[PDB]
Structure 1
Amino acid sequence: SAQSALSGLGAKLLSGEVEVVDCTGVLGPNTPILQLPPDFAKNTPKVEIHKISEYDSDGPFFAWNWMVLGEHSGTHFDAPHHWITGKDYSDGFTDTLDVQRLIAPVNVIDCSKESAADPDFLLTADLIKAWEAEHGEIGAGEWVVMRTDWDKRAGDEAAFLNADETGPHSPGPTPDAIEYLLSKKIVGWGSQCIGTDAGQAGGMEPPFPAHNLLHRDNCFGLASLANLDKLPAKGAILIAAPLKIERGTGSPIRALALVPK
């Protein structure tokens, strides 16, 4: 019974037998933001928070703010329209995508040890297959996220981007890794890095394969995910819903996970 499922869930939430895990980083001026080559493209802006009032002459009984905020800021969601490969989907925007897809079991692939050894670590199809053999098949409509514990760098932007003369160095997936996931008909793929692709994904074929391939198939991306170390490899539910921005290509989100405990 669908209803007993929901009531059961409501009770376990209230009792804490199902724990809500906060998978989101702090959104503010110090939030790390993508930096692109300025001869390649314009930058998304840094986050600004402007006071309107704080129990004062501008607003006696209340405190509130407004913001300068890019769609693609902090922990955030990538809609298919965000990439040329997904431009023609009429349901590829934040205000037109199908919300039934947004909530699903999540596969948490732990690559944190590898990531620390090599900042340019790449998750491959063979490695995903190995993970499947240990933990279980990745299923249709499920979330797949790469845990790297990159969020430990979220307090310092330079370290979070981890760039040198050759560019950003941060972990991510190979092109074949993404193709293989898309053959499993997943809903989307997520990272704890600045974007869904490795830092060095500009020199990949195709460039930015996560972005390219995910959106080609009308699938979603998630970036700057926090606290994937508190999720199990299998069995959690990921909730990742963008603001309903008009013709939005993306949005910051409050990524939440449901885990047993």
Structure 2
Amino acid sequence: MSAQSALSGLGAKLLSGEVEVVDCTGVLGPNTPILQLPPDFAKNTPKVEIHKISEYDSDGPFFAWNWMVLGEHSGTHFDAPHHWITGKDYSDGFTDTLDVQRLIAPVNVIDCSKESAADPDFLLTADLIKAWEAEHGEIGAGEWVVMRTDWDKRAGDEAAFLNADETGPHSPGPTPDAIEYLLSKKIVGWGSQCIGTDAGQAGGMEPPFPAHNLLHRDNCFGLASLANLDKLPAKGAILIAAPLKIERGTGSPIRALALVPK
């Protein structure tokens, strides 16, 4: 029941496989889907590039390695509060100044996959979250909450992943009141399997991009392009979602990992 026993126990169960590490990360490379914004509205974050330095050749006889062109907000990634104007004044709101204690926490996995398959603009509401809590247990302070949509099935095709038509991107997300409600429970942050933490059509919500707006307003975090949420239980897993320690970073690609039973 001591912390040391918990950690030794974790170590043993990892070796035996009784605790499994789930990879919640998509592949990071040139094909990784990247956010597209209207050019008149904002500059785009760049597509990922991987450049060879050497691979056991005359440029590097005994070793292989690469360098990258890499936006902070690329692939499975982390949003720090400085990312949004509402979080701009937190001195601790950068990837290098935030509290790493907050990064590893129990995760609440809200399965919206059937609803999102039927309607790509599916919105998770405060009422639906409360019904989820009624069934699974209350969402608690410091916990991660992630919206499972199985949108990662589309990640091999950027067009399919952004899912845009004449009126813009169509991908599921939260309502402003859903995020407001989660924040009232003092969550650490909110995660999506889509290109961002907000619905594709959030550009037209009040406020616009409410997850971004409200999370970062409250010094909380966002996660995007999460994979393999279908391998997690609704309750009980621990999510590890840690940004690179980028100097004054607004966000970071991550290796999101989850600990799950069995």
Instruction: Provide TM-score, normalisation by structure 2.
Output: 0.99
Task: Spell out, residue by residue over 1:175-226, the C-alpha distance to the aligned partner (whole angstroms, 9 max, x if none).
Answer: 0000000000000000000000000000000000000000000000000000
* Alpha-carbon separation, structure 1, partners of 2:156 and 2:77: 17
1:194 pairs with 2:195: yes
* Alpha-carbon separation, structure 2, partners of 1:56 and 1:26: 26
Q: How far is the alpha carbon of 1:2 from its aligned partner? A: 0.9
Q: How far is the alpha carbon of 1:253 from its aligned partner? A: 0.0
> Residue 260 of structure 1 aligns with which residue?
261
* Alpha-carbon separation, structure 1, partners of 2:164 and 2:261: 38
Instruction: Provide TM-score, normalisation by structure 1.
Output: 1.00
* Alpha-carbon separation, structure 2, partners of 1:86 and 1:97: 12
Task: State the secondary structure of the residue aligned to 1:144.
Answer: strand
Task: State the secondary structure of the residue aligned to 1:52.
Answer: strand
> Residue 178 of structure 1 aligns with which residue?
179
Task: State the secondary structure of the residue aligned to 1:116.
Answer: helix
* Alpha-carbon separation, structure 1, partners of 2:140 and 2:46: 37
* Alpha-carbon separation, structure 1, partners of 2:142 and 2:253: 22
Task: State the secondary structure of the residue aligned to 1:182.
Answer: helix
1:108 pairs with 2:115: no
Q: How far is the alpha carbon of 1:251 from its aligned partner? A: 0.2
> Residue 28 of structure 1 aligns with which residue?
29
Task: Spell out, residue by residue over 1:76-126, the C-alpha distance to the aligned partner (whole angstroms, 9 max, x if none).
Answer: 000000000000000000000000000000000000000000000000000
* Alpha-carbon separation, structure 2, partners of 1:225 and 1:85: 24
Q: How far is the alpha carbon of 1:32 from its aligned partner? A: 0.0
* Alpha-carbon separation, structure 1, partners of 2:121 and 2:21: 31
Q: How far is the alpha carbon of 1:48 from its aligned partner? A: 0.2
Task: State the secondary structure of the residue aligned to 2:61.
Answer: strand
Q: How far is the alpha carbon of 1:131 from its aligned partner? A: 0.1
Identity of aligned residues (%): 100
Structure 1 residue runs of 4+, over 2 Å off? none
* Alpha-carbon separation, structure 2, partners of 1:210 and 1:85: 11
* Alpha-carbon separation, structure 2, partners of 1:103 and 1:151: 22
Uncovered stretches (5+) of structure 2, i.e. residues with no partner? none
> Residue 17 of structure 2 aligns with which residue?
16
* Alpha-carbon separation, structure 2, partners of 1:145 and 1:25: 16
Task: State the secondary structure of the residue aligned to 2:21.
Answer: strand
Q: How far is the alpha carbon of 1:8 from its aligned partner? A: 0.6
Task: State the secondary structure of the residue aligned to 2:29.
Answer: coil
* Alpha-carbon separation, structure 2, partners of 1:153 and 1:6: 37
Uncovered stretches (5+) of structure 1, i.e. residues with no partner? none
* Alpha-carbon separation, structure 2, partners of 1:5 and 1:190: 27
Q: How far is the alpha carbon of 1:160 from its aligned partner? A: 0.2
Q: How far is the alpha carbon of 1:145 from its aligned partner? A: 0.1
RMSD: 0.2
Task: State the secondary structure of the residue aligned to 1:199.
Answer: coil
> Residue 67 of structure 1 aligns with which residue?
68
Aligned residues: 261
* Alpha-carbon separation, structure 2, partners of 1:218 and 1:170: 25
